[PDB]
Design a protein around this ligand. Structure first.
Ligand SMILES: *[C@@H]1O[C@H](CO)[C@@H](O[C@@H]2O[C@H](CO)[C@@H](O)[C@H](O)[C@H]2NC(C)=O)[C@H](O)[C@H]1NC(C)=O
Lengths: 49, 96, 49
């Protein structure tokens, strides 16, 4: 029940913002307040051709 | 053939192209954006609607909606391979 | 990005760009942060321009 990482820094007021490859999901958006998604991501599978 | 080109959302245009044989999309998506559920600037449903949308994205509900409503295909004939000759293509030599 | 920068193009994402969770990267902020509105508007302006 303790957040670690960039979300951990934002939650515990050690950082106002967390810029980076930060994916939006339900739990994080419950614990922090995300902005508009500025790049599309999501689960994907990469295999050798 | 009254309008040469129609600029519109990727989802709607791609669905129309998949459904209709005589229509085809171009490509090179621009102004990448997303459909949102608009609400007034001071509303009580803001956070809950956003969280429900995110949760439906996390599981397969939005994938199920795409499958049932957008991701079904009637006539496509879209490939990079060279076209296969058909009756009308070489009916001239048969009549010859 | 890794597939684009891959050497020899031996690695590919299946489905020709198949994305499952289709979320997006966001700028994390503290709950009820006063910067959310300005950051959202700025990001949307950047996308529009
Ligand atoms: C929005 O969602 C929140 C969280 O689910 C709701 O708040 C809870 O509501 C239930 C039912 O009234 C209560 O039993 C909980 O104690 C509430 N928890 C919190 C965090 O207050 C809220 O009712 C929902 N509705 C809106 C639009 O605000």
């Amino acid at each position: 029940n303790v957040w670690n990482g960039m979300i951990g820094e934002v939650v515990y007021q050690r950082a106002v913002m967390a810029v980076g490859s930060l994916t939006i999901n339900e739990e994080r958006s419950e614990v922090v307040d995300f902005s508009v998604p500025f790049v599309e991501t999501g689960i994907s599978v990469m295999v050798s051709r | 053939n009254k309008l040469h080109a129609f600029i519109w959302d990727s989802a709607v245009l791609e669905f129309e192209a998949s459904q209709k044989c005589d229509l085809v999309t171009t490509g090179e998506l621009f102004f990448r954006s997303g459909f949102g559920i608009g609400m007034r600037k001071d509303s009580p449903w803001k956070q809950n609607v956003s969280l429900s949308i995110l949760k439906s994205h996390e599981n397969g509900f939005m994938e199920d909606l795409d499958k049932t409503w957008v991701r079904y295909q009637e006539c496509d004939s879209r490939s990079n391979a060279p076209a296969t000759l058909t009756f009308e293509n070489m009916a001239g030599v048969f009549m010859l | 990005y890794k597939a684009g920068r891959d050497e020899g193009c031996k690695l590919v994402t299946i489905g020709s760009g198949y994305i499952f969770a289709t979320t997006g990267y966001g700028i994390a902020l503290q709950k009820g942060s006063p910067w959310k509105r300005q950051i959202d508007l700025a990001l949307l302006q950047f996308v529009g321009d």
